[PDB]
């Protein structure tokens, strides 16, 4: 979608692993605010949005 009409998707009720993301997308930019990616596979969350 375009920025002024971005698309949002709710992801919850599932087993999430953030180690497979490194595969997809050469990752021209990959940075986090408030968390660090290496520790992200560990914490537990309420409801994750995309």
């Amino acid at each position: 979608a375009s920025v002024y009409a971005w698309n949002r998707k709710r992801i919850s009720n599932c087993v999430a692993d953030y180690s497979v993301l490194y595969n997809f997308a050469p990752f021209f930019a990959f940075k986090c605010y408030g968390v660090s990616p290496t520790k992200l596979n560990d914490l537990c969350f309420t409801n994750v949005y995309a």
Partner: protein
């Protein structure tokens, strides 16, 4: 921004009381650590305070 004071963001294991570490080393990335560069991981240990 006063770029004269920095702080260690990446450490393998925490440190015992009252020791200081001044070694500059590039973080690893689940493979033989990047020898001079920075990808998804392999970030620089020191970040300026500014």
């Amino acid at each position: 921004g006063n770029y004269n004071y920095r702080y260690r963001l990446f450490r393998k294991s925490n440190l015992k009381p009252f020791e200081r570490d001044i070694s500059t080393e590039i973080y690893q990335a689940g493979n033989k650590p990047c020898n001079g560069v920075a990808g998804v991981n392999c970030y620089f240990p020191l970040q300026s305070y500014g």
